[PDB]
Amino acid sequence: DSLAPEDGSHRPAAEPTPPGAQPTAPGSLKAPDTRNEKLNSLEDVRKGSENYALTTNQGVRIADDQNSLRAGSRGPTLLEDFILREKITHFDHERIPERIVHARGSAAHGYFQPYKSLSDITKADFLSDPNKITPVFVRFSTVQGGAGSADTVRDIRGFATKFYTEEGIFDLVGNNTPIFFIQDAHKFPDFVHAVKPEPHWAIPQGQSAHDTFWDYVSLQPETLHNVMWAMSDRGIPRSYRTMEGFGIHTFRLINAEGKATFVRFHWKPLAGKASLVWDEAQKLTGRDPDFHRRELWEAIEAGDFPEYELGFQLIPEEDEFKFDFDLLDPTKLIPEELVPVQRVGKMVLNRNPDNFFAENEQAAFHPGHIVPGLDFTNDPLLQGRLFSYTDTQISRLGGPNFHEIPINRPTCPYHNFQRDGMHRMGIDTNPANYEPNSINDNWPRETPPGPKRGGFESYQERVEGNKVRERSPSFGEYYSHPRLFWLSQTPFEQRHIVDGFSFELSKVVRPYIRERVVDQLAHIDLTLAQAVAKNLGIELTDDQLNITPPPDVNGLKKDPSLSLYAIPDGDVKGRVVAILLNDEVRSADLLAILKALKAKGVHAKLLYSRMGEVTADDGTVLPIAATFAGAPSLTVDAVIVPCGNIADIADNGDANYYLMEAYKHLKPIALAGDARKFKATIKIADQGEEGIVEADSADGSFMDELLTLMAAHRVWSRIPKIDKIPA
Amino acid sequence: DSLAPEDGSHRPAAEPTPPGAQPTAPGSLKAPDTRNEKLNSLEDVRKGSENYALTTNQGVRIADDQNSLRAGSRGPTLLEDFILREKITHFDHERIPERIVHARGSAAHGYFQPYKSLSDITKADFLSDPNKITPVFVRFSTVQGGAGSADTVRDIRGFATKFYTEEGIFDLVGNNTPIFFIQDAHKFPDFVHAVKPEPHWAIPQGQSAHDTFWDYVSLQPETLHNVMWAMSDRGIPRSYRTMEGFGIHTFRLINAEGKATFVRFHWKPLAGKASLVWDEAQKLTGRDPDFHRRELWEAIEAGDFPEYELGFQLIPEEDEFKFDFDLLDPTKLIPEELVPVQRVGKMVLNRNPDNFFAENEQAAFHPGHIVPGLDFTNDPLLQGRLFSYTDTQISRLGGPNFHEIPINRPTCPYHNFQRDGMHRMGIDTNPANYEPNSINDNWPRETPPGPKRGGFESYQERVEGNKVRERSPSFGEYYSHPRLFWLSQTPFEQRHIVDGFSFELSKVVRPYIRERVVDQLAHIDLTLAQAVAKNLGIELTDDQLNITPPPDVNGLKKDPSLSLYAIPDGDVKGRVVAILLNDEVRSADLLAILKALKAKGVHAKLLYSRMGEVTADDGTVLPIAATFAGAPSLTVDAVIVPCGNIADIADNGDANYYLMEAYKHLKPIALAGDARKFKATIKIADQGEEGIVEADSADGSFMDELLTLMAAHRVWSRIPKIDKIPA
Ligand code: HEM
Ligand code: HEM
């Protein structure tokens, strides 16, 4: 019929387009030809639409889908309208339980491939041949807020990877900091209850700036290392593409001869590390609560695929007690300076889902999903987790057959004698459902352990001790690893940590709790302690001033791997720039600007006060992407204002604030020709200053200064200036 | 033990305190003596804590609640730790399904009481005697976002009241606008799917500014009246206390002689009507996503109880076809100018819950929960709703016994022969579970209909027609009631509607959809059409310019009841003012200011750049409530800056922006003495201007000008000025 516009404009191009150039689509429709083995096997449950009749779930076609069956057109609805009651019953039952933690979350499809065979250290088939690529499904998440919460909150992010391997599913479920808050799994409910919304009134959402959180931190000094990380810029990332990932426990790699190696897993972001600053990150949860979900979907549609390196920290079994921290302690990190991360392979995320609920919401990831070649250790938080993620699926996913939900199915064979349970999909033809059996000659059969394709056998570690509910004395140290983290931060990074604690703590209503947290900080480092204390109006006791600092970590004084900005690495590719238009824009400026950006892989948004299009001075028509208020500075990386009829936007409060917000959030600002009038707005010396690129015309060098600032992410040197600005 | 601070400061005072003066508490603990019949009956399921041992759910006391049972303190956790597995199993299963619509929501306890007996019109016992007070439970809600979404979004709000009456539960489930979007319940799934997050990527949250929403509006002209309301300031309220509520369908009141009267239900806010402005409302979902949940909890703890008048629009059965709109059409409002709202009683909300999940999340409200004295009509949206809210509880609340969940239980008797089903609490001693029966002599027995305490009998309306799925021709008019709404708006109210449509529509990526919505507006009113069109770069076709406007509604040209601000009514009580401190504040100013505010019932927040306390010039100690960045202007109603050492905050970017944001959001600003220096910031004539109160000292008249502006809510006359401000 019509309803569709002919000119075809309702459908997106099935090819990479920049951010916001087209409506977004289902994966299959946007990228018909990105295939892999898991993607192809879901084909049996994909449903199309075009040229199909509207039906009931029982196949009966519907003639009127606008009206209920009533006795006369102004009369009562009849109980025999089965078409209406089916349509409203399925609506009434749409929602399943959300994840009790990590409910927010965004996922994509892609693959893993090893750099070389690691057969010398593990008999794990997915790592056995550099030529073997493995389908993955990855979901990035926050920790506290429900699925309806905002993306750019201050929190730990999760990073879960499902590996569809030839010998089983290996789920590597980690987060973006290398230590957790708790040593023992028995305390997990108390910690999650304390971070979560408070019981009486369910406030706050997506925030730890509340009394109970900080109450439990002050009473539990083991939480302090990971609270330091959450209080850093590490707690507000720019993108899921711009963060590290970590498995946090020590695991084992078992090779074909039986040798066990301890390992810790890392994910290194090939786009560099980068974070937002808090005023930006907080305002942006109001301006776009879906910023992280949006930008991942769109990087993949523009072809700016996310890529990460899998990296191992290997430690021989003999060195188990070589460090002055316990390797099985989850609140201790292993400094890369002591043990290096060896890069093992690479992961590429290159396809979005077709249906968020079906693929993303129904995905089950559990750390107990290991394969031959891997094994667990006695880490007390890892041992408890193992109980949990099988259990939780019985209500979230309705039952013991969650592995039959299509995103979760092994792409390799699985046969065993488990029968029945809710929405059992497999019809078992085996005459036996028990072993040992003679009637189907004992099939399916047990397999002995071996080098390739053998059964799972656990590593025969020796256990001796009594049945005790008791914490190991080796776990008893709470302060050298937070001070190592603190000392490895650049100065503006440390500022930002002071300010993180000061904001959060200002929101605790009960002052004894805030004092209790400053006492703990004085055991880490007094400078840190004094700075936070000051913002809160607290004085340190001369005794607090005489607390002796913790020891070094194996004589290490700092490790720069723990900082985000100290050793620089920066994608300018896939970043986004806002260009502020006016009604007679100088095309000379504009075609130079856009060419430069295109060569580097950077996306532009042409922004105005009205939608529709303006016309450059040469009569070129430029379509406007958003208004100044519609796409705030908050959502880009740099602002460029070309020359032209400047008088048009000069008096506009929105165009001027666009620049003041951006200035304050430490972003590069480039002013060509008369656009330099706005220096007077953000208060700049005619003599100039760093981070403001200015010139007579937009050209090659002007763009070079801009892209160079952009590779450096923010102009940190401006931090003294930005305090006098009211924005 | 300790952990508690002695000085007692961890516990709040069990008496009314202002906003933020104390930590908030459970209802029982904050207000031990606000009782009512429903509150007292929940006493059988309230659980205390103090002086009690920590136990398992089976009563076994726990000695170590910090550690798991392991074979040696660095060894594996044992499967026989039943204490650990119970604690983690209940955690694993915390979450039930959320409401498929209206999932966000905030609730409180209180009562209803009639002004007089309405026995002449209804035999409904809760309305029979002015001396009969009825327990209510009320939940205010949004419509689109999940339970983790933000409170101050642009959306319709719900307003659901559970009346615990002597003859059954009467649930009056309504919203805050008087018409709905859809005529027939069969379309409800298509409309909710179109407003909701889009299927492929689940964006956006809490927003209708997306293509599918506006696609379905342009193709469905019956949605246009209620979209006008959502696009007005009516879609962003200041508080749940500052809005009207409506049942939207025509219902029947049946008296003891059998006479039926049609009725429409209203709730009139005794604090006046008031809304936020969009930049404010949007930024505030970032700055405090729980603003509406918070402020309701705290009005009730300060004793600023919410109060509403129940009001009836009665129409005799004979006048059923007297209007030129169908009374059974849910997209048509009945102008108060044609039919007056008669005030029937009053409702007071005076007690918060003890446990949000238990009381609020498990509450089931359904419109089919009517009592004797009330009945339904053939409204096609009301008839479908009736199916739905029984159905949805079978998964949300796990089963057919949701009425046994304590918040939902009748406070009056209920006995019948329904047996079994999941978490059946009642043990039935009746030897029979069927009627007719002789073995328990037919008890419980059927009751005949009568004037008081009789059985439910339906009104014997005549039905004649054929079984047809067909819409009545009387429902076919889509445009005079949106133009009546439009013409009844003040000029700045209409501005705000233009700007609502222009923002939302700028976020549709597909331009043909935006054009399609402007065509529809040109059928309502051309001024409206031209304004929106302009912001979007769209030109109206000369044919669009020649569309004939819709007819009047029964010769009515405007009704001022449809505007928020035209006839003024304003609580200054319970509003909140921010006072910007400095380090030598003049106490003369301050004690005058706070006395004035206290006499009017207005709450102050003393705000500084640091927490702790400053000292007035006379050595008074003032404790600081938040920082300027911690409690933004966004969260108060007016700003007062007293005199003192102004030089201290004058150069502070935060203190200056605090004033520019507030200025722009049209709030009253009061400057005493040297504080008038800041006029230079917000750019004011020395000669002064309206809405900026200024003087040599804070005194009686200065405060009078301020409270008077405050009773008028915003300074609408500033709207021409605020465009040049960059904030
Ligand atoms: C090193 C510490 C931990 C890390 C790195 C971690 C990581 C994660 C991640 C990334 C998810 C999100 C799953 C998804 O995206 O679907 C998750 C879910 C969950 N975690 Fe943890 N977690 C940790 C500790 C714990 C502990 C101690 C428990 C339980 C005793 C626990 C229980 C769960 C459960 C029940 C879920 C929801 C499970 C599901 O939906 O399948 N986690 N965790
Ligand atoms: C005049 C139009 C309508 C109004 C005023 C209205 C109002 C409401 C309100 C206020 C709630 C929130 C309940 C709570 O706070 O717990 C609600 C829930 C709900 N509504 Fe509506 N609604 C309307 C139309 C519809 C229609 C046509 C359907 C179904 C065919 C529907 C289905 C539901 C369901 C299934 C829920 C969740 C029910 C529950 O949780 O108990 N509503 N509605």
Curated annotation (Swiss-Prot), chains A, B:
Subcellular location as annotated: Cytoplasm
The entry's keywords: Cytoplasm, Heme, Hydrogen peroxide, Iron, Metal-binding, Oxidoreductase, Peroxidase
Pfam families: Catalase, Catalase-rel, Catalase_C
Top class in the EC scheme: oxidoreductase
Binding site for heme: 389
Residue numbers spanned by region Disordered: 433-467
Reaction equation(s) it catalyzes: 2 H2O2 = O2 + 2 H2O
Main localization, broad class: cytoplasm
Cytoplasm found in the keyword field: yes
PROSITE patterns according to UniProt: CATALASE_1, CATALASE_2, CATALASE_3
Role noted for this protein: Decomposes hydrogen peroxide into water and oxygen; serves to protect cells from the toxic effects of hydrogen peroxide.
The name this protein goes by in its record: Catalase HPII
The species this protein was found in: Escherichia coli (strain K12)
Gene: katE
